[PDB]
Amino acid sequence: EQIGGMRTYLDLLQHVLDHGVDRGTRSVFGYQMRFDLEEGFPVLTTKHLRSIIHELLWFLKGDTNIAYLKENGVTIWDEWADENGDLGPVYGYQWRSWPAPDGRHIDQIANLLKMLHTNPQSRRLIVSAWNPALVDEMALPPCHCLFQFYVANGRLSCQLYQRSADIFLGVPFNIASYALLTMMIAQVTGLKPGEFIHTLGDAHIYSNHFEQARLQLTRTPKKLPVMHINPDVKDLFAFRFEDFRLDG
Template sequence: MSKYDIIYKDLVEDIIENGIWDKDQLVRTKWADGSPAYTKSIISKQIKFDNHEVPILTTKRVAWKTAIHELLWFYVKRTSDVSYLQENNVKIWEEWTRTDGTIGKAYGYQLGKPIPKPQGVTNQVDNLIYELNNNPASRRHVISLWNIDDLHEMSLYPCVWHNQWLVKESKLHLIVGVRSNDVALGQPFNVFQYYVLQRMIAQVSGYEMGTLTFNINDAHVYERHIEPLQEQIRREPYKAPELWVNPEIKNFDEFTIDDFKLINYKHHDKVPMEVAI
């Protein structure tokens, strides 16, 4: 039985039973019909994985290739131009794509933004790998997607807004900071993606896998997602699959979708849910 399915079930039940409604507020998000998309939230929630198995849900099908495509777009392509997604038939950013074919100065733009360092002009991803290799004991291995100067030019403020990496006993640990987490649709993507990213960074920097921790400031369930989620978490989980990552890749920027295979992924059917915009 998948450990993530158990963690996820507990989280969903906690939010539905104990969460705080925002119906007393004017909310930004809306449904396609224009009505307010209200949520129930838990404030400040932490979930942690020992990484002994792949954290992907089995109580529903998670579009794992789409999740990796988005990850590659952010961290390898390091751009906000959606042409990579379009070329790979990934539609998850269509609602936020601007007329210029980008999502503004969000996510990949921040990761690819040039930064001057003593070793030359670099970017946040290359700098992270350089520092992990050359200064592993540092507690400054941080990537930030929250640039206050560029927020007004982003189609969507970053939900997963920073991550920190720690090396302890030759193991690479990852802590992911999430300001706002749509538990029904966003979180299953986020958890799997950052596990994959941790595998990628660990491989090219030569570390063993440590723990993966998510610190979620606002963990919420949308009102129209409650019934589908209740149906989902009643399903019996399957055993977690295995993820093959091409061991020949030693340069982070050489990763492509063909370097990943999810093996023996047994899952229940997809659970249809509306997207709040």
């Protein structure tokens, strides 16, 4: 009985191969995975972490300019940058500066942190990157629409709603990122990591990966490495790359 993060991901891989409907992609609509963050850091790649951490710090700064990423050798957002390196209203902007009609900006992250301190049992510990007023004008509307937190038994859990998920090339990165974010938020709120719950809308695999996805279905799952986070950081916005260390 192989049970763990890799298996849960491998189960998704397998479900979409067996029951997915092609359209190359192959897809299902609606899926949900749970990862116990206490078991280890959900590295679900057979095979960079640098991109993951820097991207996440980049999100949290509210930056939508590719420069900080390029400065730290992260290229994942290059192909969407305009002449000035701007991306438009992507995650950082939505998270830190959600534009209200009256010109105010809603710092959803700071609001979440305040709400976690004052009302951890709240049922609206929510950050949304899905803004109907802006998605039509984005070349790449946010795939990670909305995420919600929950606090029970001193543990912080996070559920992500992801409208579109390439299960083979995207989902492992997606998982690592929000698991890391959950861990960072748990730390600064004095909570232990709970679960990351990954909910998928269109969960798909392209036809050029149909055969590879099977190379993973037989693979023996390795022990999850531990993500070590500098325990002194109490300000979510003050994290640095060096604050993180993953086994191996």
